[PDB]
Design a protein around this ligand. Structure first.
Ligand SMILES: O=C(O)CCNC(=O)[C@H]1CCCN1S(=O)(=O)c1ccc(C(=O)N[C@@H](CCC(=O)O)C(=O)O)cc1
Ligand SMILES: O=C(O)CCNC(=O)[C@H]1CCCN1S(=O)(=O)c1ccc(C(=O)N[C@@H](CCC(=O)O)C(=O)O)cc1
Lengths: 261, 262
């Protein structure tokens, strides 16, 4: 995607050399923003084939509030395997905070249910937010939230969403992360009888890993293709009732997939 | 400031006419990002006279973890007065979450101390963050956090900070918000022996209130003047020991103040 490729090139040109906690190098920049008008097409990177199957299953899993990889395992999604403990647990990552953020008195807050009611009853609210950044639970998580905070906004019948991503793996994670939130906007818009607006992506520490440099160079030598079109084939009873088969991508014409360590 | 006037113009050019919570119309855009290199000068708006006095007091108050207006009121800073209850309390707003976010198991996390330790000992950490967005306590607050989540970053000996501001009053609030976080960056950099980098400002629902339009167009007819300079006169033993008199602003020559209704 044009904006995605411009970001890759900016990291290459301006990124500073850093040594992460694993001793793996990265080139990194701080602070970047991109905007995708969802009426122009579904923002699935075309300069490498991206498998939407894992993107969809991960999002559905987040929305169920599940933090055990069993469901991902039942569907051959392995992206979370290395973080899980022997029991397949990740601690209270993403999904748990989205659906049952724990309060000190023993209660839980369902941010997704709150957002859906805010969209339906108070669409001009300036606080239609979901935060996965539960400071009090970070130590229990396998990974502190990278795509950490997001906000919805409604104008002229269109639903937009902005994500604050505190740590971004540009080559491997970003393509996935953009598609995930774009999909969520389509699902929320459908459930609230709205059209799709923009997906605004904001990055904090935004980096390319040193072992993704050959892959990045290959990807940047390719020209982007017109974006695909997302089709939802069935309108479920709620935002929590989607299934994998409800989504179809049409007109997706990517360059060959690119493997990275 | 150029960036600030450009944002005002963007809201005017692209914003959607809506109605705020109280009905008071707003013009709003969603999603914006701008950067201030703090080595260029302290980012205090010059196209209208802004008083740094109130900004400093508010930041020292946040850093103490205070949520009662008494300290502000005593120092003739009245920006929070309208929000307070009969005893002066705001509920667990900004300062309380910064200094003592309550966990589920009964602990309290001092996020400011955490960030200072991360800057000194692991400056390349990708999670040097402070969040005031405590989902469990939002409805106990007089105002849910507008400047809600911020992250620090270090490169080439310089400290940068990015703020995610979910709701922004462009005319009245923004000049204060930018100066507040820029001051914080200077303070943190001093405490960690770092130089200042950039302050990156990102907006969510970014709006101009309908009753600030003539004030906004008046401000947009003026040319930004050179940025002022910030001089910190002492290096306290901790980030929580700064005093009002430690900060001095030099070379501030703004256009006339422009009053506006909140
Ligand atoms: O913040 C950081 O630096 C990273 C933090 N690391 C992370 O945030 C990890 C933890 C697991 C999910 N993410 S991720 O969204 O960044 C991710 C996304 C995709 C892959 C990946 O391996 N994708 C394969 C195909 C998988 C499939 O589609 O079935 C690909 O080639 O695209 C890995 C991690
Ligand atoms: O998000 C939103 O829509 C706003 C939510 N509302 C807010 O976030 C309010 C709650 C109180 C502090 N803020 S503020 O940072 O937006 C603010 C800052 C300055 C003023 C103001 O009144 N400044 C006067 C003089 C003050 C002084 O110098 O002592 C001026 O002329 O600049 C008002 C609010």
């Amino acid at each position: 995607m044009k904006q995605y490729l411009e970001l890759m090139q900016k990291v290459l040109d301006e990124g500073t050399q850093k040594n992460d906690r694993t001793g793996t190098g990265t080139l990194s920049i701080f602070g970047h923003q991109m905007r995708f008008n969802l009426q122009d097409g579904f923002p699935l990177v075309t300069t490498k084939r991206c498998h939407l199957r894992s993107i969809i299953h991960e999002l559905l899993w987040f929305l169920q509030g599940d933090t055990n990889i069993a469901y991902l395992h039942e569907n051959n999604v392995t992206i979370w395997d290395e973080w899980a403990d022997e029991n397949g647990d990740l601690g209270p990552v993403y999904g748990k905070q989205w659906r049952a953020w724990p309060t000190p008195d023993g209660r839980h807050i369902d941010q997704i249910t709150t957002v859906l009611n805010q969209l339906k009853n108070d669409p001009d609210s300036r606080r239609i937010i979901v935060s996965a950044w539960n400071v009090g639970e970070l130590d229990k998580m396998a990974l502190a939230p990278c795509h950490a905070f997001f906000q919805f906004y409604v104008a002229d019948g269109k639903l937009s969403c902005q994500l604050y991503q505190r740590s971004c793996d540009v080559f491997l994670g970003l393509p996935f992360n953009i598609a995930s939130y774009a999909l969520l906007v389509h699902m929320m818009a459908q459930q609230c009888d709205l059209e799709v607006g923009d997906f605004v992506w904001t990055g904090g520490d935004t980096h390319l890993y040193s072992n993704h440099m050959d892959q990045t160079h290959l990807q940047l030598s390719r020209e982007p293709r017109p974006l695909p079109k997302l089709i939802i084939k069935r309108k479920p009873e709620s935002i929590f009732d989607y299934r994998f088969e409800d989504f179809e991508i049409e007109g997706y014409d990517p360059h060959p997939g690119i493997k990275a360590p």
